[PDB]
Amino acid sequence: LRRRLKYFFMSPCDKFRAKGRKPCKLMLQVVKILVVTVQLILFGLSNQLAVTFREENTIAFRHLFLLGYSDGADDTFAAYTREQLYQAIFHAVDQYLALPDVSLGRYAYVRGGGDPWTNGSGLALCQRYYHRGHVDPANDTFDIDPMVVTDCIQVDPPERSYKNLTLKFHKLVNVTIHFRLKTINLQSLINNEIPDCYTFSVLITFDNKAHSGRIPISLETQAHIQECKHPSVFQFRLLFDVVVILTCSLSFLLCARSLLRGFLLQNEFVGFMWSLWERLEFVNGWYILLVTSDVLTISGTIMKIGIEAKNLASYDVCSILLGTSTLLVWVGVIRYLTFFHNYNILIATLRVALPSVMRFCCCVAVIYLGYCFCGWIVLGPYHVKFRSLSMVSECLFSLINGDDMFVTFAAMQAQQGRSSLVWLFSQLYLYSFISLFIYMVLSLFIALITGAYDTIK
Amino acid sequence: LRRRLKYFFMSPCDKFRAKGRKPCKLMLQVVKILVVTVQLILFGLSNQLAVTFREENTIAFRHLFLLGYSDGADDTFAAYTREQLYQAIFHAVDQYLALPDVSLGRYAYVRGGGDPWTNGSGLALCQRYYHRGHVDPANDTFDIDPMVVTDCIQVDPPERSYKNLTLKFHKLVNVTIHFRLKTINLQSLINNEIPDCYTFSVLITFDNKAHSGRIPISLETQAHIQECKHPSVFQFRLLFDVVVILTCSLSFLLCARSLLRGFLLQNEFVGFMWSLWERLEFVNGWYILLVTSDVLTISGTIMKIGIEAKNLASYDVCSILLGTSTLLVWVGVIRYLTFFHNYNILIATLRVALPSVMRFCCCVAVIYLGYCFCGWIVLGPYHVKFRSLSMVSECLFSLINGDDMFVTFAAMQAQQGRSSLVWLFSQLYLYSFISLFIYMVLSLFIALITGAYDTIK
Amino acid sequence: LRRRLKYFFMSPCDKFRAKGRKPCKLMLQVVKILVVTVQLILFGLSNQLAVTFREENTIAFRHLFLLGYSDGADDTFAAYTREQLYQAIFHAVDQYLALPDVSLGRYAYVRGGGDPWTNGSGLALCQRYYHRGHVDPANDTFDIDPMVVTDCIQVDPPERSYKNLTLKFHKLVNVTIHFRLKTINLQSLINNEIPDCYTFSVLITFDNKAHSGRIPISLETQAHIQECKHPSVFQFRLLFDVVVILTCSLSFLLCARSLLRGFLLQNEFVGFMWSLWERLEFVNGWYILLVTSDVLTISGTIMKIGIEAKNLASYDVCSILLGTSTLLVWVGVIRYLTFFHNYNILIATLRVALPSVMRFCCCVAVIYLGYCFCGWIVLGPYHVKFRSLSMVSECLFSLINGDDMFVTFAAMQAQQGRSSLVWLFSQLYLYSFISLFIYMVLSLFIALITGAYDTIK
Amino acid sequence: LRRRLKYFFMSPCDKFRAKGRKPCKLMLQVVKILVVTVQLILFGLSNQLAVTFREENTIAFRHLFLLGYSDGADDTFAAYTREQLYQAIFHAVDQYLALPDVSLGRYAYVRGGGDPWTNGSGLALCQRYYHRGHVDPANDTFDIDPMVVTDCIQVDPPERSYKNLTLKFHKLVNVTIHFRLKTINLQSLINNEIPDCYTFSVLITFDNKAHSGRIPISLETQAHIQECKHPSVFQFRLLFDVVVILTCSLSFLLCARSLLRGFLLQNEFVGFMWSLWERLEFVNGWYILLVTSDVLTISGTIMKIGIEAKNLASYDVCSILLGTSTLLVWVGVIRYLTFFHNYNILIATLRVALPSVMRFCCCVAVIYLGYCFCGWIVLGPYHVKFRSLSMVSECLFSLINGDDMFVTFAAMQAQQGRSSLVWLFSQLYLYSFISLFIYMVLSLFIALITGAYDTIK
Ligand SMILES: CCCCCCCC(=O)OC[C@H](COP(=O)(O)O[C@@H]1[C@H](O)[C@H](OP(=O)(O)O)[C@@H](O)[C@H](OP(=O)(O)O)[C@H]1O)OC(=O)CCCCCCC
Ligand SMILES: CCCCCCCC(=O)OC[C@H](COP(=O)(O)O[C@@H]1[C@H](O)[C@H](OP(=O)(O)O)[C@@H](O)[C@H](OP(=O)(O)O)[C@H]1O)OC(=O)CCCCCCC
Ligand SMILES: CCCCCCCC(=O)OC[C@H](COP(=O)(O)O[C@@H]1[C@H](O)[C@H](OP(=O)(O)O)[C@@H](O)[C@H](OP(=O)(O)O)[C@H]1O)OC(=O)CCCCCCC
Ligand SMILES: CCCCCCCC(=O)OC[C@H](COP(=O)(O)O[C@@H]1[C@H](O)[C@H](OP(=O)(O)O)[C@@H](O)[C@H](OP(=O)(O)O)[C@H]1O)OC(=O)CCCCCCC
Ligand SMILES: C[C@@H]1CC(C)(C)N(C(=O)CN2C(=O)c3ccccc3C2=O)c2ccccc21
């Protein structure tokens, strides 16, 4: 029995020289790395095509429909006078009507199809305001019914009015322009793929929710991919996907067999004992990782086949699945380096250090979260790097690693002459956080890790 | 007696299993964390509304009143010819007079109300120059009485001259335009709050104090919030604030009772001894922190209630109080992790290391301050990162942490061809500071911290 | 025999006091450092002249031929309407025809010389489209023969039509403008060199391969250097090159003699032994480095002489050879510091640490490569820092060293509102990579290096 | 005798309790810190005034005389057509002639005064070209006499032609415009100082030395300060300078007396011995530092008095002297912390570590210099961060500290498609340098420093 357990925990070379076992799993792992990486790159080709089409069309729409737009001005593009706003709205509508004559792309109009478009209408120009608004700052008084009323003007695409629009400025909530355009992604021909039919839903927003005299203007698009009706293009990916599936399936079967054998050996040993952690010694975590990677790879390959068959269009989900599977396949090869001490430093140190590291992180995390919330709420209105909770976490994590420090300090230097108390608070906040986390938290973290390494040295 | 002292220093679980004590303070701490964080976020909503209103109105004013203004040009916006300055001034006044017809916001005029406006005057256009100025650079001579004379033209808002302004360029100190606008912060309705009435005091400055042929132009605003006169809006925060106050009060009472018990036990022990540091062993600093946090939270909640009641408008003070209280509430939960060694590494190391760290910082601080002053005065006129003492401290602290180094070096590369001696001095200054502080000071600092950790390992 | 081996491993001073040997190699090394560095700088003069000529001419071409071009707009310069594209094309052609009257430089036209220019034609204006293209997005259908058809209009340079161009927009692949200009690099006279004759091949591309309504416009140049036909300029570099060659040749001969002596001593010792690593003890790696440096220096000097003689024009290859040789010459002087322990810390630590460091890097590299591939494919379409594999490696290597962290996080903040799943994946990817590599991999790497140092301490 | 030496090495408190000695030097040091810092700030006021005047006048000149100039365009401002160059030159001359009517500043003209101005001429417009230039790129030939010929047109300032200029474009070396303007720095009145008279020498350069079709345009100024002739301004710095001088003189005398006493004690001890390093134990380096600081402070104060007296105008030299003296005064206070071990960690570690650190730097410096030269010559023409040797050193030093890594990599990504060999070389160069210096050099440096600290722990 003892020899059986000794063989169970033996390296591939030792196992071979003991029982002449062929190391099929190692060669399978190498082949998997190669084929999975190649498949990921091949998929990335089509993913890039789709993304490029969407973003390039969006940029073209911004240049076509936004009056006076230039690249890099997205977050400051705004109107400041009634005349500017009217001109921008009319420019957008006029460009929509003139698209077939001026645009470099080939677009088709879409009519009807539910709200906000009536039947036969291509463009909806809607203004939303308050049901009752009387604003008299001269008398410091107002009378408001905040229920929002929407008034929409319908414009039919030209056959191959909106100029009377009167905006209720003092109670205006916003103005929106909605329309849809159909186009074809011809560039797919370069990848020997049949072009898809795209529908872009375009929304242009003139936002007055702040009632501050400045109305920002933005353009957004939603892309819907569809198979074209009986297209025609004059005159091995499926087989490669099948090969990937076969390799992953064989690897999954072998790993499952190994896991079952380990479970049976664990049962036999426990029986021969006439605990839990001692039972986990028989569970190969690397093989759990391998089977998870195989499942992810097979699911991603099926999704990729479906997308190429035009049954699906979830490019992002497929990309995430395949990329995660590729990373896991690359990582899984360390299972065989684990057998040799000189090549196993990282894994051994991680194993020894994880408990204390997690316990330390438990205590550090509450301080981190307190700082996150405090900065988010107090400094967010004044600091571009504290606008949202996730952004605050990113900024603080970067500061812990010594990145982007002076710019973080400098962003607040504008408030020194206007909101001095907030500036002083920001000084204390930033100095205390940086000192505490760089000099105390990180030092102890590295000390724990290096002491764990010293243990297994 | 000894058993009493032993119990006094026992963990919540040990205390429970000894005397069946319910750990009310721990549950109170958890509830406090939750409710205080929620309160901070809820307050942040209104804080953001107010700040957004102020800044957006200021940006709109800059676009409305500054001729040729564009975003991002604030620190270089200037006039360079007499005609440009006259056009800018007249544009500002004309836009002030045309505001009701062109602005997207709804503004009301303010008249009189003391200097610099006379009764019935909405806008004050003032030029300040020298009482006697005769400047003859051709003869290298001048005759100056530096007493400043102010001449103001009053403009009444239009009923629903300044064009004869003659600037004394050779002795002109500056030109200012002052006016006030009233508006209403309608966006508050989205938060189910009654809109406030804002008065913006707008100051436009054309600054010629340098007499250098370049006159920078700036716009600044001061916002005053007030309750509107009998407003009308058609059809649980107070209760949540009350709940926060109740939780904080109960926590304060429990902590005070614990502190009193500790003080009584300290007195009894000293009496049984038939020093100072030995007495401080009976003072729970965590409970001092907790009572301070409770006081801050209660004060912030009272201020927030007052602001919501429109009795106050000090948003920044309330935000600082509540954010600091939230951070302290999050930190205070470590008092219970302190009882377990594996989770107490950070606090124990801090306790052991603070004295030596402070002694080391004492010596390092004088070198830091010498560098700060030297850089501020020598390099400040030439380096954008050394303009002020606080900016110098920020730059040097970032350099200590390895941040923003090459840009700091590059800012001086422009003076290599013009002021070479200053450039060489900057080379020596920067190299010496970086080497000394990164390689010697920081190494010893981390060594002290890690040795202290080794002591408590 | 033992004394012979002892003397073989003796330092230059010890060798001199033993046998009165003159340390010629050390003096040769110092002289080599001096002369090789001087030669590198002297070559850099001409290299800079050539590179400046090319780049400045390219910038001038961009300003001359691209309608509305401005500096810094290269990667966003594009057309968005049919009229803009026609105007840009016609502007390029008209400027090509008007060059002799408007350009600040002096250029000559080139005619014929093969495709795409016919005989006597200076400019080729070609449009490439699909052989058959019928695109009907209204009916969601198309009929495409993707064979590319090129149609070219030839323009002869003016004697000292293209306006009828009709673009097939719906099936247009791209438009190109090809022409060549001849000029003379007169600035070489400042270096006392005869000016060369340059031919610039200019390609202007209007790219429509994405069919997205946005057509980027770019200009590229290829420079061909040639000797001018019998030029005339009115009224020691070769000798310095000869001196460098002589010094390197003598150093090479001495190093080869030393290596032969070491090999013979190794043979004698092995014979007196009546393994491999023991044999390598007799091989001076520093002398292998020195002979390699001598070969590189001699080859670079020959190439430099040929370039100055106008027989060659491979400035980049010569620069790389000479710079690498200079670096190796500077490095080789450490061979003599190696004899003294206090000055040999770095080399001794490297010797002791290299095996373990390489073994560690073996395991770390697979994780690094998995991350590289995953990021390249998943995030490349959305992140400017992940566009290519080399860019991904640069970004990840910078992140390992704590550089450019917050900007990497912020680049993805735009996808939070639009592609949230990809944003969440990017969050996990970046956080996991940074934590794992900064806190675990780097800590162990430094620990291995410092332990190796402790061994030789 | 032994007691005398024991007293010689005794702390101020111990010395006082032994012989009742008053610690005058310590109080003098504190007073020196205060007064020297205050003096530095007071001087910085005037230094800032002067620097601001110069820079603001230069910016105003750029906006006045450069056609189409805008802020931030200095390094790309250039002309690209003959018409643009003619318009820029004529605009500069016309603005010079129209200055009295358009400028916001008040300037006086300067006539004659030697080359390049003839008697009575205010502006010199010179073109420099080749004596003989025949350039025929069509025939690939030229005939050049590179002797430079200058032709100058003189323009007299308007009483309160150059339009016939014909540029020889094909052999033009450059065009320059020279003129001088006199003005008065009135802002000094705010500091209660008499305004100085400034003469600005303005040089505008249109540079064609590259003959590349692009002519960059630049403006530079030289400022000369002078005392105005009998100025008149209607109705304690000297005393503070005297106080600083008195304090520094007393400190210098006390330090010199202490040094003499130490020297005499050293002589007596050596005599009682009936080496060098043992003699250096009697030399107080802190007092050498103090006397050097006193000399610097006194010289700076004298120079400052002279500048305020208008006998000198060397603001930069005075600022450097005073700032260095302030830094040294702040540093010198550590002499008294040196007596206590807990506060003497830094100095003791530096003393123990300096020899080994210097020996290590000796070996590292040759590698650093090899990299510097190689990068400067090979990558300088292609990389904005490698243009000059000092800039290369700054970039490499920043990279050693992990700063600005990704941007350094990205600057070369433009050459990947054009000069691929140089790009690959840059890849190898940057990766090798960063790895070697961050992971090996710095680790050993910190290890040496921390081992030295461990010695004195
Ligand atoms: C009698 C029990 C029930 C029936 C079992 C039948 C099994 C059968 O036939 O093959 C098993 C091997 C396993 O191949 P593979 O998994 O590479 O090899 C096994 C593992 O090394 C395992 O250790 P771990 O890797 O640590 O889990 C070890 O215990 C097994 O020896 P042991 O059996 O003495 O315990 C090995 O056989 O499979 C192939 O080597 C590829 C076959 C396909 C080749 C063509 C591919 C296109
Ligand atoms: C006889 C002396 C004078 C009268 C004293 C009357 C006291 C009374 O009644 O309760 C005290 C407890 C304290 O609750 P709490 O503070 O959670 O618990 C105490 C602490 O654990 C204290 O240690 P530290 O935490 O280290 O300071 C410990 O010494 C006390 O035991 P000891 O008394 O044997 O010394 C505990 O009672 O209060 C509640 O547990 C919540 C009550 C409100 C529940 C409803 C809330 C809505
Ligand atoms: C008898 C054997 C065959 C014939 C050999 C004839 C050799 C001859 O003549 O000179 C050799 C020396 C070598 O000069 P150099 O290489 O500087 O010096 C030798 C090295 O130090 C070598 O050790 P490593 O440096 O560790 O390899 C050492 O073993 C040799 O001693 P050893 O001979 O007792 O073993 C030295 O002679 O050359 C000159 O010092 C410059 C001559 C040119 C001066 C003018 C320049 C313009
Ligand atoms: C007999 C020898 C020749 C005549 C010497 C006459 C000297 C005289 O009169 O004063 C000396 C002291 C020195 O003052 P000060 O330098 O502060 O004090 C001396 C130092 O502490 C010195 O040690 P280090 O600091 O380590 O070098 C120590 O050896 C001397 O004692 P010792 O003499 O027993 O060796 C001290 O007198 O001066 C004042 O304390 C300020 C006087 C001005 C006060 C007004 C200022 C406005
Ligand atoms: C927190 C910081 C730690 C350490 C880096 C050791 N340090 C200095 O090196 C010098 N130093 C200052 O004196 C200072 C004042 C204000 C802001 C920043 C700094 C600063 O960095 C130091 C010294 C004293 C107190 C704290 C510290």
Sort residue B325 into left (φ over 0), alpha (ψ -120 to 50) or beta: alpha
Name every protein residue with a CB atom under 6 angstroms from any ligand 2 atom.
Answer: B 15, 19, 21-25, 254, 258, 261
C325 touches chain D (CB under 8 A): no
- Asked if B70 and B182 sit in the same domain, the reply is yes
Distance CA C99, CA C90 (A): 14
User: Residue B50 in contact with residue A379, Cβ under 8 Å?
Assistant: no
Distance CA C339, CA C348 (A): 11
Within A343-419, where are the H helices? 345-379, 389-400, 405-411
Asked if D132 and C234 come within 8 Å (Cβ–Cβ), the reply is yes
User: Residue A187 in contact with residue C211, Cβ under 8 Å?
Assistant: yes
Which H, E and C letters describe chain C, residue by residue? CHHHHHHHCCCHHHHHHHHCCCCHHHHHHHHHHHHHHHHHHHHHHHHHHHHHHHHHHHHHHHHHHCCCCCCCCCCCCEECEHHHHHHHHHHHHHHHHHHHHHECCCCEECCCCCCCCCCCCCEEEEEEEEEEEEEECCCCEEEEEEEEEEEEEEECCCCCCHHHCCCCHHHEEEEEEEEEEEEECHHHHHHCCCCCEEEEEEEEEEECCCCCCCEEEEEEEEEEEECCCCCEECCCHHHHHHHHHHHHHHHHHHHHHHHHHHHHHHHHHHHHCCCCHHHHCCCCHHHHHHHHHHHHHHHHHHHHHHHHCCCCCCHHHHHHHHHHHHHHHHHCCHHHHCCCHHHCHHHHHHHHHHHHHHHHHHHHHHHHHHHHHHHHHHHCCCCHHHCCHHHHHHHHHHHHCCCCHHHHHHHCCCHHHHCHHHHHHHHHHHHHHHHHHHHHHHHHHHHHHHHHHHHCC
Residues 6+ apart with CB under 8 A from C43: C304, C318, C319, C322, D377
In-domain check, residue B412: yes
D254 lines ligand 4 (CB under 6 A): yes
In-domain check, residue C306: yes
Distance CA A287, CA A332 (A): 9
In-domain check, residue A60: no
Expressed in angstroms and rounded, the spacing between residue B361 Cα and the centre of ligand 5 is 7
User: Residue C178 in contact with residue C117, Cβ under 8 Å?
Assistant: yes
D296 CB-contact burial (10 Å; exposed 0-12 / middle 13-18 / buried 19+):
buried
User: In Å, how far from its chain's centre is CA B197?
Assistant: 24
- Asked if B295 and B219 sit in the same domain, the reply is no
Helix/strand/coil for D249: helix
Distance CA D232, CA D195 (A): 10
Distance CA C442, CA C400 (A): 8
Distance CA C127, CA C178 (A): 12
φ, ψ (nearest 5 deg) of residue A284: -85, 100
Pocket test for ligand 3, best of C35, C250, C257 (most atoms within 8 A of CB): C257
| Alpha-carbon distances of D95 from B208, D63, D66, D213, rounded to whole Å | 21, 10, 9, 26
B357 lines ligand 5 (CB under 6 A): no
User: Residue D390 in contact with residue B412, Cβ under 8 Å?
Assistant: no
User: In Å, how far from its chain's centre is CA C68?
Assistant: 31
Say which ligand is closest to the CA of A264. 1
- Asked if A214 and A76 sit in the same domain, the reply is yes
D47 touches chain B (CB under 8 A): yes
Query: Å from B268 to nearest chain D CA?
Result: 36
Strand-pairing partners, residue B175, are B127, B206
- Asked if B367 and B331 sit in the same domain, the reply is no
- Provide the residue type at D14 as one letter: D
Distance CA C98, CA A448 (A): 73
- Asked if B217 and B76 sit in the same domain, the reply is yes
Closest CA to A92 of A79, A106, A76: A79
D443 touches chain B (CB under 8 A): no
- Asked if A322 and A448 sit in the same domain, the reply is no
The resolution, in angstroms to one decimal, equals 2.1
Strands C232-233 and D78-79: unpaired
CB contacts of D207 in chain C (<8 Å) are none
Expressed in angstroms and rounded, the spacing between residue C292 Cα and the centre of ligand 3 is 20
Within B66-113, where are the H helices? 82-102
Distance CA A396, CA B422 (A): 36
Distance CA B8, CA B20 (A): 14
- Provide the residue type at B434 as one letter: I
Closest CA to B43 of B211, B209, B244, B221: B244
Distance CA B195, CA C457 (A): 74
Angle at D434 between CA D430 and CA D435, to 5 degrees: 115
Q: What angle do the packed helices D24-65 and D285-308 form, to 10 degrees? A: 50
In-domain check, residue A55: no
Longest C-alpha distance within chain B, in Å? 97
Strand-pairing partners, residue D127, are D151, D175
Secondary structure letter of residue A77 according to DSSP: -
- Provide the residue type at B232 as one letter: S
- Asked if D196 and D73 sit in the same domain, the reply is yes
**Domain stops at, among D204, D226, D248:** D226
B412-B415-B417-B423 Cα dihedral, nearest 10 degrees:
-70
Peptide bond into D100 cis (omega under 30): no
User: How many C-beta atoms lie closer than 10 Å to residue B284's C-beta?
Assistant: 17
Secondary structure letter of residue A275 according to DSSP: -
Which structural technique was applied?
A: cryo-EM
Helix/strand/coil for B106: coil
Peptide bond into B146 cis (omega under 30): no
Peptide bond into C231 cis (omega under 30): no
Q: How many domains does chain B have?
A: 3
In-domain check, residue B59: no
Distance CA A408, CA D68 (A): 35
Strand-pairing partners, residue D218, are D205
Distance CA D269, CA A89 (A): 96
- Asked if B257 and B217 sit in the same domain, the reply is no
Q: C34 is in which domain, residue-wise?
A: 2-50+236-339
C82 CB-contact burial (10 Å; exposed 0-12 / middle 13-18 / buried 19+):
middle
| Alpha-carbon distances of B114 from B97, B126, B161, B175, D238, rounded to whole Å | 21, 15, 21, 19, 43
A388 touches chain B (CB under 8 A): no
- Asked if A120 and A155 sit in the same domain, the reply is yes
Neighbours of chain A (3+ CB pairs under 8 A): B, C
Distance CA A239, CA C150 (A): 35
Peptide bond into D116 cis (omega under 30): yes
Closest CA to D47 of B58, A330, B374: B374
- Asked if B323 and B447 sit in the same domain, the reply is no
Expressed in angstroms and rounded, the spacing between residue D37 Cα and the centre of ligand 5 is 20
**Domain stops at, among D317, D339, D361:** D339
The DSSP H or E segment spanning D182 is strand D172-184
In-domain check, residue D58: no
Asked if C81 and A102 come within 8 Å (Cβ–Cβ), the reply is yes
Strands B78-79 and B141-155: unpaired
In-domain check, residue C323: yes
Neighbours of chain D (3+ CB pairs under 8 A): B, C
The DSSP H or E segment spanning B124 is strand B123-136
The DSSP H or E segment spanning A299 is helix A285-308
Q: What is the CA radius of gyration of chain B?
A: 31
Residues 6+ apart with CB under 8 A from C205: C174, C175, C176, C217, C218, C219, C220
Distance CA A300, CA A296 (A): 6
Sort residue D193 into left (φ over 0), alpha (ψ -120 to 50) or beta: beta
User: Residue C90 in contact with residue C163, Cβ under 8 Å?
Assistant: yes
- Asked if D181 and D45 sit in the same domain, the reply is no
Q: What is the CA radius of gyration of chain C?
A: 31
Say which ligand is closest to the CA of D339. 4
Secondary structure letter of residue D159 according to DSSP: P
In-domain check, residue A143: yes
- Asked if D311 and D399 sit in the same domain, the reply is no
Closest CA to A363 of C61, B347, D276: B347
Tell me the CB-side half-sphere exposure of residue D8, using CA atoms within 13 A. Answer: 20
User: Residue A141 in contact with residue B230, Cβ under 8 Å?
Assistant: yes
Ligand 5 atom 19 nearest Cα: B397
**Domain stops at, among D304, D324, D339:** D339
Distance CA A308, CA A302 (A): 10
Per-window interface: D 391-430 vs B, CB < 8 A: 391, 394-395, 397-398, 401-404
